[PDB]
Amino acid sequence: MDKNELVQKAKLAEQAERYDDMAACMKSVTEQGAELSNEERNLLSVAYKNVVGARRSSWRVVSSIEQMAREYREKIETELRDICNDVLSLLEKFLIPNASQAESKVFYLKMKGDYYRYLAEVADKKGIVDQSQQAYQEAFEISKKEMQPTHPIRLGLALNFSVFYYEILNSPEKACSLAKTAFDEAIAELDTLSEESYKDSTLIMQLLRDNLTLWTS
């Protein structure tokens, strides 16, 4: 279909909770090579998050049950792995290279972080983790630089990078310092929040806080 049509179909897929369709549409818009709009970036991300999410949740179930169980877990793991490699390849070939605006660079580097992190969950492992850490750290640097503590993308990033430290690097204290600094800095500057971003920024500040409560209790 055409870009506009694909975007429109991704939105309908989204409403119909047909995330594999949604992702196919957004992968197609991404493959034409024009830079993604903010709306298109969010559609891409929501689609793949749900597509990969189904597989992570299934994998968790079956890995926890686990030879039949192992083969199934292996099966779910390969789909999971292909979806991440898909996203990582789009990011490497189109999105990161073509970003240019800092918000998008942060967004896509955060996403590379995430998808290597999902690969790390089922993982070769040391390189995946390093790839994850590398992406998040560069996203995190640009975000501190170009971004202000209440920006939802920066808060989002702190949130997942804190999870990465906690879950993948098995470092609760770094996860907590990251979350707490992120939260503290945002709440110190709430007057910097726009009408557009306040609900997203406060929801994400609460997620940081819920995490910190769990990790320090």
Binding site: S45, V46, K49, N50, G53, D114, G156, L159, N160, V163, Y166, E167, I204, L207, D210, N211, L214, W215
Partner: peptide, 8 residues
């Protein structure tokens, strides 16, 4: 996992 990352 009781801790959360960014929801879609």
């Amino acid at each position: 996992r009781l801790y959360h990352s960014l929801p879609a």
